[PDB]
Amino acid sequence: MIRKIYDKLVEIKNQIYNIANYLKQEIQDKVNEYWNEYVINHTCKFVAIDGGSFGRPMRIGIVYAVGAESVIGDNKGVKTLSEDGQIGIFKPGNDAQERISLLMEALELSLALRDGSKGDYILMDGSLSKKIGNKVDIQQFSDEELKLIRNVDLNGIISIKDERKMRDLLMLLNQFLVSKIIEEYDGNVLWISKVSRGRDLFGTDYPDITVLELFTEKRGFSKLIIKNIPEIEVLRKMEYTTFYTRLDNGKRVIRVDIVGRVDEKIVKEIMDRLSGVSIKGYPFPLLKAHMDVRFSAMDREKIIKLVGSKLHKDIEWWP
């Protein structure tokens, strides 16, 4: 780093005060209007799914690894149910990082169908909007390619020649997989995120979730927001509900999306139940799922070493 930069900082006061003042005069009032304290709490099984992935640009191509885990938790305990993950190589390309992540999302969502029915609720890591992905051109696709979607053939989608088509087929797969989850599990799926760009509530330069963390402290929940978006088409008139909750005094606020109509009572029931498997304001089942699938710097080191050995072993003219 440049020594000059850091000395100089020890300039930015202009932006700090601006943002502070703007925020104070924009919505110190409306926050408390739109927040509901819920301080009292009150046996219920959660299956949590999260995923991890990475890809490193190399000469043989983009060497990647994806993994997802389902985790069952209650009062009595947490244990892993399933693990699902592949290591592999993609050919060089502009959407390689995005294909890797979509492939990861694929495994998560498919574990939601595998083990979802083993609990009362399913906790996914990430928002409904983000898991669904953007709109996809359904016209570059032949009859055969649409089937891969229907039959949930990952090995097949991966085997595609073209790059744009692979990213796009994987996007479709995820939309079809969300759709199955929604129809099988109705309001029992909770899509939870620590981060969000939503402004439905306050309509400011900053996101709502940040607004609530600045101007409320106590355990609670926000005004409910009602949002909209083959079988995929049955997801076009899905209306869902968003709220923001803090499960524990002084801790982070999270976003929850639940497909269906939901009321105060349901929200308080969902908070009370989540609080029983939560640590420091967040559901342990998820934190665990997340921690297990993460690829440490060390994990990455191991993987590359392995792959580079199988190169140097199989191929003789390789440097």
- Closer to Mn ion by Cβ: residue 246 or 290: 290
Q: Which residues bind a copy of itself (CB under 8 A)?
A: 1-6, 8-13, 15-17, 19-20, 24, 52, 57, 59-61, 65, 67, 69, 83, 85-89, 91-92, 94, 195, 197, 205-207, 210, 213-214, 217, 292-296, 299, 302-303, 306-307, 310-311, 314-315, 317-319
Residue 125 interacts with, from a copy of itself, Mn ion, none (CB under 5-8 Å by kind): Mn ion
Q: How far is the CB of 294 from a copy of itself (least distance, A)?
A: 7
- Closer to a copy of itself at the Cβ: 212 or 259? 212
- Nearest to a copy of itself of 52, 267 (CB atom): 52
Measured at CB, which residue is nearest to Mn ion? Answer: 125
Tokens, residue 157:
């989608």
CA distance 35 to 219: 10
Show the tokens assigned to 39.
Answer: 């301080």
CA neighbor of 46 nearest in space, from 311, 278, 302, 224: 278
End-to-end CA separation in angstroms for the chain: 34
Q: Binding partner of residue 56 among Mn ion, a copy of itself, none, CB under 5 to 8 Å per kind?
A: none
Tokens of 2: 């440049």
Least CB distance to Mn ion at residue 51 (A): 5
**Lookup: tokens for 210:** 């940040």
| b/e per residue 10-36 (b: at least 16 CB within 10 A) | eeeeeeeeeeeeebeebbeebbeebbb
| Phi, psi dihedrals of residue 64, rounded to the nearest 5° | -130, 165
Residue whose pair of structure tokens reads 């803090």 in the numeric block? 246
State the binding partner of 24 from a copy of itself, Mn ion, none, CB within 5 to 8 A by kind: a copy of itself
Q: Which stretch binds Mn ion (CB under 5 A): 50-58, 127-135, 205-213, 270-278?
A: 50-58
Total Cβ atoms within 10 A of residue 262: 19
- Distances in Å between the alpha carbon of 205 and those of 7, 22, 68, 231? 30, 9, 35, 37
Contact between 125 and Mn ion by CB under 5 A: the answer reads yes
Q: Any binding-site annotation on 50?
A: yes
Least Å distance between CB 259 and a copy of itself?
A: 25
Q: At closest approach, how far in Å is the CB of 288 from Mn ion?
A: 13
Ligand-binding site membership of 29 (annotated): no
Q: How many CB atoms lie within 10 A of CB 318?
A: 11
Q: What gap in Å lies between CA 186 and CA 180, rounded to an integer?
A: 10
* Residue 85, contacted partner among a copy of itself, Mn ion, none, CB below 5-8 A by kind: a copy of itself
**Burial category of 312 from C-beta neighbours within 10 Å (exposed 0-12, middle 13-18, buried 19 and up):** exposed
C-beta of residue 103 within 8 angstroms of C-beta of residue 91: no
When the beta carbons of 87 and 138 are compared against a copy of itself, the nearer one is 87
Q: How far is the CB of 49 from Mn ion (least distance, A)?
A: 9
Q: How far is the CB of 232 from a copy of itself (least distance, A)?
A: 25
Site string for Mn ion, 79-118 (x = CB under 5 A): ----------------------------------------
Interface residue list for Mn ion (CB under 5 A): 50, 125
Binding residues for Mn(2+): 50, 125
